[PDB]
Amino acid sequence: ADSCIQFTRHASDVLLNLNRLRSRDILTDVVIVVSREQFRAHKTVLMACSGLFYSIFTDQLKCNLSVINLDPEINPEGFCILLDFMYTSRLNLREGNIMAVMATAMYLQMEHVVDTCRKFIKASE
Amino acid sequence: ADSCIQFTRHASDVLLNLNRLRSRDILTDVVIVVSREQFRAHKTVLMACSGLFYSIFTDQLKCNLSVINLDPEINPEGFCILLDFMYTSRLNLREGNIMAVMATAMYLQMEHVVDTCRKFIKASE
């Protein structure tokens, strides 16, 4: 209906609680493996944030996997930074990690992150 | 880190995608039964929005149930309105549904919704 009222902080409060569930390992249903590192997460949050995970978990066979192995070129710290961004809206972008974050965001199909990485790199040229 | 940048629309965009997954029945993992009506949802979104579902799905036995039956006094339309609010931040509050929405929000432990229902009722007294 068009007569709805809206609670401004709702989406942010939901994301905060999803991050609290992730921190406590509650109802996490997939482990993402990035070389030697493992990251537990919720498939729905991954799909909601990434074109790659949206494609993976809508596949009729991959939707049922409990472990997903990423390409060995993917940097675990870059993945960790992006996983934290998925669950908090905050991206820890630094001179020392920007190339890895951008490469990981291109692989994960997270265009908005790729765009801000490109802008930050271009400003330092 | 304290040097993060933030994408303002991220939380809202995540919630929009969770609602699209719900509409398409993708990765839904529980059916909530409210008298004769059934509602498919994601357990993590329910927990992130409701004190009752947070308690239910953190219980070591109930976390594994695929069906949850609500109290027979709960109005299905009231539940539907609140489930839509969980997934969109929009509450379809109307003169004809406010008492049922408020009763359902009290049962679901959604205080912010209870508070706005009380304010709207008080304004019409």
Binding site: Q6, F7, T8 | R90
Partner: peptide, 5 residues
């Protein structure tokens, strides 16, 4: 909070 969206 609440607003008219």
């Amino acid at each position: 909070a609440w607003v008219i969206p």
